[PDB]
Amino acid sequence: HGYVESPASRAYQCKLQLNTQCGSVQAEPQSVEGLKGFPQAGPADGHIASADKSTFFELDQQTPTRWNKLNLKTGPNSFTWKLTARHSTTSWRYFITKPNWDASQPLTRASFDLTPFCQFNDGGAIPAAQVTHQCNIPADRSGSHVILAVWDIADTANAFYQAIDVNLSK
């Protein structure tokens, strides 16, 4: 159990009062948990942001101005997870929407470049309460986008999904 606290994920902003109308998730942004194996398996299209968790379906809403977006530059960035429960870990992966993705429709695999721009494999080790990954956001991405940070658990069938709303510039 954990969430991306910086840049504050969609789910987490829901608790800080930076995002509203989220529902249950604002009570526990660290529990956006669903099946692992994305993108081959995992959350069904249209329910990726909520990890296909019915009680978190508010997260699946998608319109050009629905979510509060953070302003970031392409290139080097730092993503920090805050874990409320530390489990044996297989990997951490970050995906970003393709250029020209439809920001007026619910997220689907067709919305994302299915190859993560970066991946960290922990060999099953249990992570510290704070985890920070540094990756380069693709330079060909500008304007409104969604970065999906996925945490795959090694000893269970699940993963945690953290959608992050962003507005990119050079």
From TrEMBL:
InterPro entries: Cellulose/chitin-bd_N (IPR004302), GlcNAc_Chitin_IntDeg (IPR051024), Ig_E-set (IPR014756). The gene is gbpA. One of its GO terms (cellular component) is extracellular region. Disulfide bonds join C14-C22, C118-C135. It comes from Serratia marcescens. Its main location: secreted. One of its GO terms (biological process) is chitin catabolic process. It is found in: Secreted. Residues 1-166 form the Chitin-binding type-4 domain. Gene3D superfamilies: chitin-binding protein cbp21. One of its GO terms (molecular function) is monooxygenase activity. Keywords: Monooxygenase, Oxidoreductase, Secreted, Signal. This is Chitin-binding protein.
